[PDB]
């Protein structure tokens, strides 16, 4: 039963609220995360001018143990390139084999093979000493 | 009152250890 | 006289041959009730009685099929080739699966097989989860009827993305087909801490996210134990992932359920005994006492409950109906991944990767007082595991419980690997093959393995009987001596009954039939021809 921490974003919601109409259309290095779960780092400037910062956690970006979802409702997902439907760097903690952290040998390297083969993802890294799976997506 | 459970537990423990002595009972097939 | 693998009354130009004559996944395209069989061929189901079709070819002189006795066509509303047919317990409902969709066929009166029948022939088909089991969502992997479902009308479906859905069907209420009574996301449950957390599924959650469980909890198959099982077995859903892992859910019940007369009293004794052992033992951990507590709480909902009495849909007799206990919770703990003790080392990828699971439930204290979990790999490897510890009812803790730092880590659940053997030669192994288990009609401890390469018969008798006798042994001594001989015994027997040569055509999952008139035989089929191999005639 992995502990689900609190959501967070960078820049903070306060910082984004303080941005003018120009700046909020091109928030650089926008990141949404949840402690002891993972994070989504968008790899381009994003347009947050039509996104409620008070209804972002759990509504648009859902971070659960071993699970990252952006725009969970397919019907209300913006076109590719608009909103948060852009390339991103996702990191998921606790992404070890279901057998547990104490899995080595062929079973562990088999797991890394399976991570690389997950469709619509580009494998970045997996570290057994932390259990963090990092990978890139082009859209959601 | 019910010592049969200890007997079951011991019996199955013995099956395990017995299967361990023989080693993995693996029967694979060859082409010919 | 071409060498065929079926009797003359199932080969062309016999009328019985019409049942058979005209993509990765399982092919359970044959189902049966008595001597009747249902054969999926594309988007239609071919219905026929083997008894009449036999007689027609024996008493021969020298298009819905209404002109042919003992043969009828069943057109279906499916939009893709049928993959699986699953007969219900009382054999009145038939589950019809494509890769993604599920239809329930209300099986028609058998009188429609006679030529004399002039009345209109339009078997009712019900769509199951129109917005749930769809091509735009996760594929359906297993459909199994709940052993304890009222009127045998409770169905469990499982998808690749490990969502378990219980449907409690009533033809008098369309809504029962539209939505499930219970929906469990195993991926949420696996990582949950408390029994009251959210394990449900959102109708709005249509866009897939990203997770290692996309492969690690990709479901290959699920089953309930063979019925006539005792203890917790008939409330235990077993699952096998393509990753090689095995899971169990217990107790999984629909909102309402029907136990055989002996189930509840046997469980009560089992629960009472477990509470006693937990309390009497001073070395009992607070985690061990909680399981006993939760089970006692579950049972208390049943003791203080008066069972309702309702008719049998296909019957002439009333039976007790209970409601599911609400405490400790509706969703049991997900148990697993099970550790395979004495597992073979250096298993290959196609040996670890699972494609089917078949569980023979413990029998009340005729057979073995232990669950037997059988696992089928892509390679056709079969693994026979024994549930030494005994899977039982478990739930996650309540939020009332305070986490203790000096508490030991929960050791993973375990199965004992008793035996592992190939059923295919290396040359017969296909990289994406989907071999299937099938139950034997005459004994739960025998079963079949079907694969495009061929069909194999397997039996765990008399070995399971020898183990049970030792478990019930009246002898003061000699246990370790006698067990050693049993472990040295070859155990299960296996024999190939059929081999397909130079034909990559997949075979319909073997269907065992034991009729007093037609005899005892296996039924399978190629894309075009039948396979009926007999073992005992009258």
Curated annotation (Swiss-Prot), chain A:
Occurrences of domain Peptidase S59 (ranges): 5-140
Membrane topology listed for this record: Peripheral membrane protein
Annotated stretches, region: Nucleoporin RNA-binding motif (NRM): 6-139
Location of this chain's protein in the cell: Nucleus, Nuclear pore complex; Nucleus membrane
Disulfide-bonded cysteines: none
Leader peptide range in chain numbering: none
Coiled coil region boundaries: none
Name of the protein described by the UniProt record: Nucleoporin NUP145N
Native source species: Chaetomium thermophilum (strain DSM 1495 / CBS 144.50 / IMI 039719)
Gene encoding the protein: NUP145
UniProtKB/Swiss-Prot annotation, chain B:
Subcellular location: Nucleus, Nuclear pore complex; Nucleus membrane
Top-level taxon: Eukaryota
UniProt note: domains: Contains FG repeats. FG repeats are interaction sites for karyopherins (importins, exportins) and form probably an affinity gradient, guiding the transport proteins unidirectionally with their cargo through the NPC. FG repeat regions are highly flexible and lack ordered secondary structure. The overall conservation of FG repeats regarding exact sequence, spacing, and repeat unit length is limited. FG repeat types and their physico-chemical environment change across the NPC from the nucleoplasmic to the cytoplasmic side: PXFG repeats are especially abundant in NUPs on the cytoplasmic side.
Quaternary data: Component of the nuclear pore complex (NPC). NPC constitutes the exclusive means of nucleocytoplasmic transport. NPCs allow the passive diffusion of ions and small molecules and the active, nuclear transport receptor-mediated bidirectional transport of macromolecules such as proteins, RNAs, ribonucleoparticles (RNPs), and ribosomal subunits across the nuclear envelope. Due to its 8-fold rotational symmetry, all subunits are present with 8 copies or multiples thereof.
Protein name: Nucleoporin NUP159
Chain's gene name: NUP159
Full-protein positions shown: 1449 to 1480 of 1481
Swiss-Prot record, chain C:
Main subcellular location of this protein, as a coarse class: nucleus
Alphabetically ordered keywords of this record: Coiled coil, Membrane, mRNA transport, Nuclear pore complex, Nucleus, Protein transport, Translocation, Transport
UniProt-recorded name of the protein: Nucleoporin NUP82
Localisation: Nucleus, Nuclear pore complex; Nucleus membrane
GO biological process: mRNA export from nucleus; protein import into nucleus; ribosomal large subunit export from nucleus; ribosomal small subunit export from nucleus
Gene Ontology molecular function, alphabetical: structural constituent of nuclear pore
Subunit and partners: Component of the nuclear pore complex (NPC). NPC constitutes the exclusive means of nucleocytoplasmic transport. NPCs allow the passive diffusion of ions and small molecules and the active, nuclear transport receptor-mediated bidirectional transport of macromolecules such as proteins, RNAs, ribonucleoparticles (RNPs), and ribosomal subunits across the nuclear envelope. Due to its 8-fold rotational symmetry, all subunits are present with 8 copies or multiples thereof.
Role this protein plays: Functions as a component of the nuclear pore complex (NPC). NPC components, collectively referred to as nucleoporins (NUPs), can play the role of both NPC structural components and of docking or interaction partners for transiently associated nuclear transport factors.
Protein topology in the membrane: Peripheral membrane protein
GO cellular component: nuclear membrane; nuclear pore
Protein transport among keywords: yes
Entire-sequence positions represented here: 3 to 593 of 882
